[PDB]
Amino acid sequence: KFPRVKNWELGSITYDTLCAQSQQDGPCTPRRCLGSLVLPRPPAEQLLSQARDFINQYYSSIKRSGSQAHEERLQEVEAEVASTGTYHLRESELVFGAKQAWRNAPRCVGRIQWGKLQVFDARDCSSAQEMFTYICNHIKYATNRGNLRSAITVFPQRAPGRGDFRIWNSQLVRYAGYRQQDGSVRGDPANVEITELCIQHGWTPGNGRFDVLPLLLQAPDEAPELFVLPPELVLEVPLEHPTLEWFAALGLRWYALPAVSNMLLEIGGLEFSAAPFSGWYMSTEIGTRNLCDPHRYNILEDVAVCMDLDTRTTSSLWKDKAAVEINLAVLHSFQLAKVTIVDHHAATVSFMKHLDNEQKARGGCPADWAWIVPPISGSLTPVFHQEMVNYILSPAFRYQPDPW
Amino acid sequence: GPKFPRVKNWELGSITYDTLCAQSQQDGPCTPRRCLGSLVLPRPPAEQLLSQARDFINQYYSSIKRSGSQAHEERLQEVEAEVASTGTYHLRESELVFGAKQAWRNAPRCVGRIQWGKLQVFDARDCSSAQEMFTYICNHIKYATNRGNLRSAITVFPQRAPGRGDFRIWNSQLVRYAGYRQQDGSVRGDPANVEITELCIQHGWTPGNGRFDVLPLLLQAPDEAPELFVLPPELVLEVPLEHPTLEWFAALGLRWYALPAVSNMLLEIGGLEFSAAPFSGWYMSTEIGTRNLCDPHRYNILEDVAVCMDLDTRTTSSLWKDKAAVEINLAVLHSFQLAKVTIVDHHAATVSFMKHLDNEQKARGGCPADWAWIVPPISGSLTPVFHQEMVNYILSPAFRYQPDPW
Ligand code: HEM
Ligand code: HEM
Ligand SMILES: N=C(NCCC[C@@H](NC(=O)[C@H](N)Cc1ccccc1)C(N)=O)NN(O)O
Ligand SMILES: N=C(NCCC[C@@H](NC(=O)[C@H](N)Cc1ccccc1)C(N)=O)NN(O)O
Ligand SMILES: C[C@H](O)[C@H](O)[C@H]1CNc2nc(N)[nH]c(=O)c2N1
Ligand SMILES: C[C@H](O)[C@H](O)[C@H]1CNc2nc(N)[nH]c(=O)c2N1
Ligand SMILES: [Zn+2]
Structure with missing residues (x-):
């Protein structure tokens, strides 16, 4: 029931009891393991249960579980969901959910920092123009002149029937990829497609290997708008x-x-289709x-x-x-x-401390070994020798389809 | 699309679907709730041995392109008969060779499987004493080493019999360096072998004190204390x-x-278990x-x-x-x-493994692979397998891990 996790370099052994908290199925089955795969192949009830659970997590974190406020808050949720089929989060819960999502992310090796995160509330955003405003301040703050600070900006949640707010780009800053003469590609081949979509909605392309792409911001049910980042802003x-x-x-x-900008942030059932985050x-x-x-x-x-x-x-x-x-x-x-x-x-040594901290704090830590072990010198780092258990916890960051 | 796992290579963008995993009959350690794929070690009924024996025989007759033949039907009737009266059965010479090669072919943690069809299988199923085991082992080492131009090979000892003690080689490899525990607590030699070194000493070995002392072999015959044997220095290259x-x-x-030369794995074929079947490649x-x-x-x-x-x-x-x-x-x-x-x-090696995947995609509809083990310890993403998704599942014949004989 509870996995035995062993570190083959030191002989230590722990038991992951946190996995029992998983409420969602991964890609594996006892017949075969698909752990190396990159990508996996609401009724009032759903939202409600998730929301209640999330609210229970929020009050446990502030050591006021079962308290008076905990009770009234759970009621405000029943109340809002009952008549509108959904609800909204208070700014302090949103902050708790964001940090928690980073904490629960199996593919991030830098979770030792999960507790220090600056959350920018941009849920009062109504246009792609305002989005570009919030994005420019995020970059300005996160960059902090080279002394980087972790941060995330949360835009409006998704609402049944209506189009999502989206940041077409996969990172706030990405170099263009231009297909030329033959199959050749000038710049960053991974961004070939988004670069072409930018030229399609205007934009005078460059012809360099390191041209900072423009941003394609999209407000609900509207065509995306192209904005160009002030060069003094892009360090x-x-x-x-x-x-x-x-x-x-x-x-x-x-x-x-x-600055990852393509992922979806899920908190207590609500889903934030646009919420760019950044560390270093x-x-x-x-x-x-x-x-x-x-x-x-x-x-x-x-x-x-x-x-x-x-x-x-x-x-x-x-x-x-x-x-x-x-x-x-x-x-x-x-x-x-x-x-x-x-x-x-x-990074991997700090991640090791993170595992220990989490073992004491929650009884384990979701981790994707294939992603945690670095691309070079794998065994020269400590995580290579560490067994890991992967599972899905909520709040969470999830991949979502591309807008186009 | 298809009702099988989709497998993508992110460097090239090519896709394939694995249909071979449907042949698996032994569940692994994962569940839809959590993945334990990174774990090194995941934690006979007359009726059940038949299911396995019958399966292996079909596998053998399909490899020779004679499924449904009379010889096929007769071999099945014979296997059932022999088990229905002795509780076990024996593999013909050719089936042992097929089975050995298939176990390597099915090994999820081996990156050199492109060489799978080229394996020299030495039958030593007649063996009846630790001393005899040593002759076979020395011959294997002699043949496999071939003065530097190594040749893959495997030697197979008598299978596990009802109640009778197993044949076992206590060392994890036929050739390994000793591990000497110092008083200060440090280790002289290879720390991984400290336990096998101490056991040898208790059993009578006169230990040296260098960093690279070739260890002696602890060969155990059915129902007997392991006898110790030293390898002629000329054999060990x-x-x-x-x-x-x-x-x-x-x-x-x-x-x-x-x-x-791995010597601690158990070779499993059609339900038969070969507790001692050392193999080597390079x-x-x-x-x-x-x-x-x-x-x-x-x-x-x-x-x-x-x-x-x-x-x-x-x-x-x-x-x-x-x-x-x-x-x-x-x-x-x-x-x-x-x-x-x-x-x-x-x-x-990784390049050759990518070729092996393409060969197996055509031949069997897939290939069982352990990503964490296939990707090299240094320069992971610089090799092609790092960008190749892989499906892992247990297929029999197989090499399984087995508890230490102590
Ligand atoms: C403080 C420094 C940070 C470092 C050094 C760091 C480093 C990493 C690394 C090396 C990866 C894998 C990247 C890749 O292979 O593409 C990763 C993935 C990830 N990180 Fe972190 N991270 C940091 C901050 C953050 C923050 C603040 C969040 C969110 C609030 C976060 C969320 C994620 C997520 C969701 C993934 C997986 C994304 C994906 O699947 O593409 N990380 N991180
Ligand atoms: C011809 C050259 C060969 C090469 C280059 C090769 C290479 C490898 C490598 C790199 C490993 C992992 C080693 C480790 O991390 O400890 C491995 C594992 C393995 N190989 Fe091969 N191999 C070859 C031949 C063989 C042969 C002849 C067999 C058996 C018939 C075989 C069966 C296995 C098995 C079962 C494992 C898993 C061992 C374990 O789980 O500890 N290999 N091989
Ligand atoms: N240091 C990081 N690293 C996170 C990098 C995430 C990185 N991810 C990637 O580049 C993923 N390979 C995108 C992808 C996912 C699934 C299928 C196809 C493609 C990106 N967005 O730039 N973040 N901080 O500090 O916030
Ligand atoms: N090139 C190889 N490589 C196979 C090396 C296998 C290697 N395996 C090991 O060293 C595993 N770490 C043993 C182990 C497994 C599970 C739990 C504890 C310990 C060994 N025996 O020397 N073999 N040929 O050619 O057959
Ligand atoms: C196929 C395989 O899953 C894929 O190449 C993974 C492996 N590990 C990774 N690890 C990190 N950090 N980032 C990646 O993009 C990948 N890609
Ligand atoms: C904990 C983790 O599973 C362990 O260190 C694995 C990782 N990958 C490996 N890969 C190979 N080839 N050999 C090993 O022994 C290991 N050890
Ligand atoms: Zn798995």
Whole structure:
């Protein structure tokens, strides 16, 4: 009933009793495991139960469970849902639900920070124009001149029948991807599609590898509007190597603020189709995946050649060598430009403390091993040796379909 | 679309559906409520042995393209008969070979399965004494090692009989280094083998005191205390470790054996259980150069090496671990190659596994794979398997883990 979780490096053993709190099924069955898959294949009753449960969680957190306010609040919920089929959250509950959602996110290695989160309430938003206003202040606050601060801005919840508020982009800041001559792609191939949708709704494209995309904000049941972020708002870091003086020539750079904007935030049944959040990057996100993925910037061979390595054979480990320097570059740069950044070694060790804190606080922690273990040097980090249990808890961040 | 799991590769964008998982008959540890896929270890009825025996026979006759033939029907009638009167049964020579290869083919944690059809199966089912086991084991090592040009192979000992004690090899591999517990508490040698070393000593072994002492074998015959045997040094091939451009690396005196030979798994076929069936192939460089030499709970040489390279080991942001881990793997590859001993780097192996998936998609509708184990310990996303989704499920014949015989 309760899984046994073991750390094969130290021999320690814990029992995950938190999983019993899961009210939603994952992708696996006793016949086969689909844990490595990226993507998974209301009546008054539904909303009500979730809402009540969430309200019970909120009052336990403030040590006033069963109290007077707890009672009246549960009643305000029955009351609102009974006559409108739904309800609304008080600002302090919303703040509790957002932090809780981060806490419950199995694929995030930085949850040690879950408690420090600045929540911006933008549920009184009525147009894509206002959205762009809230987004500009989020970026301005989150970036904080390089000394990054975690934050999230919550826009209006979804309402039955009506169109959702949406941020078409998957990150507030993303470089354009332009399909050219042949199958070739200039810039970031992952953003090819969104780049084309931006050109379709106007926008004079650039012809660079690192052109910051415009934003396509959408208000309910209306076509999306294109807005352009003030360049002084979008902080960037030119990449250079601590010893490889020619690395800087490559003209590589990345944005300082990782701001996910494509996920759905579910709290007590309500669903916030638009709620961009941001913390700060872990160096492998940029150094290994963004720059070395074959279907991304794919700069592995370039830096290899420049390093005078033998790309003729795999056994020379030229791939591995270049990947380490490129990652070193990202770390060196950021620290030099005085912008917040965490290396995969420091991040996974803090994640280990997080597991212990959560073991004492709740009896376990939902974790997706495939995502927690970094893209390079997996076993050189402590999480590789740590067993993990994955399950879905609410509040939660979930993936949702693309607007178009 | 289809009523089977959809499987995507995110590098290429290609999709496939796994229909082979419908052949599974043993449930794993996951439930719709929680996934335990990252767990290393998830926690006979005359009627049930038939179900398995009958299934395996159909599998065998389909591989030779004779399903429904009279020979097929006769083999089934015969198997049922033999079990209905003795409570068990035996596999013909050809079925053992088929079954052995299928167990490897079905191993979810093995990245070298593209070599599955090429496996030398040595039948040693006649064996009747620990001493005899040792002759077979030495022959296997001799044949498999082949002076550096390794050849995959497996030796099969007598299956588990009713009430009768199992044949067992106590060591986890036929060739492993001793682990000596120091008074201060540190370990000299390979920490993973401390328990098997102590047991050998109690059983009569005269331990050495180096970091790399080839351990003696503890072979147990049915209903008997394990007898101990030492491997003639000429049989056990080893490779000294040097680095191509860092001359001081050789000074470290690091080395590793050439033959990887798992000896603690149970080979299961049609319900029959072969508690002792050691197999070997050849190393993927990361096994040695990353897990065995760098795991903090193994040799743990990362710092020693980083210090020699003059890296700053006081700050994780220098990526000193990554830098030393790479060079160490380059040293393993360089040394095996210079010594003319078969070895495969993680880039070559993962690429071959991607080819194996494509072959199995056509041949069986899929392939059971353990993502956490398939993706290499260093440079994960730099290899193609990191971007390949994988479905995991138990298929029989199979290699299962078995409790230690003590
Ligand atoms: C404070 C620093 C933070 C760091 C270093 C961090 C790092 C990470 C990393 C490395 C991943 C995987 C990224 C990928 O492979 O694409 C991740 C995923 C995620 N993080 Fe965090 N995170 C931080 C803050 C946040 C915040 C504040 C939230 C939300 C309030 C959060 C929510 C998530 C979620 C939902 C995922 C999975 C997203 C997906 O599936 O694409 N993280 N995080
Ligand atoms: C021909 C070269 C071979 C290569 C390169 C290869 C490579 C690998 C690797 C890298 C692992 C994981 C090692 C670890 O993390 O401990 C593995 C596991 C495994 N291999 Fe292979 N393999 C080969 C041959 C064989 C053979 C001949 C068999 C058996 C007939 C086989 C059966 C298995 C099994 C059952 C496992 C799982 C062991 C465990 O769970 O601890 N492999 N293989
Ligand atoms: N450091 C982070 N990291 C989170 C990065 C999330 C990252 N996710 C991704 O890039 C996912 N691969 C998008 C995806 C999901 C499912 C199917 C297809 C594609 C992104 N949005 O940029 N966040 N902070 O600090 O808030
Ligand atoms: N290249 C290989 N690799 C297989 C290596 C298997 C390797 N396995 C291991 O070292 C597992 N960690 C043993 C274990 C499993 C579960 C719980 C505790 C301990 C070993 N035996 O040496 N083999 N060939 O070629 O057959
Ligand atoms: C197929 C596989 O699930 C996929 O490539 C996953 C693996 N682990 C990951 N881990 C992180 N952090 N981010 C990712 O995008 C992925 N991709
Ligand atoms: C806890 C986790 O399951 C464990 O460390 C696994 C991860 N992946 C692995 N992969 C391989 N090839 N071998 C291993 O021993 C492991 N150990
Ligand atoms: Zn699972």
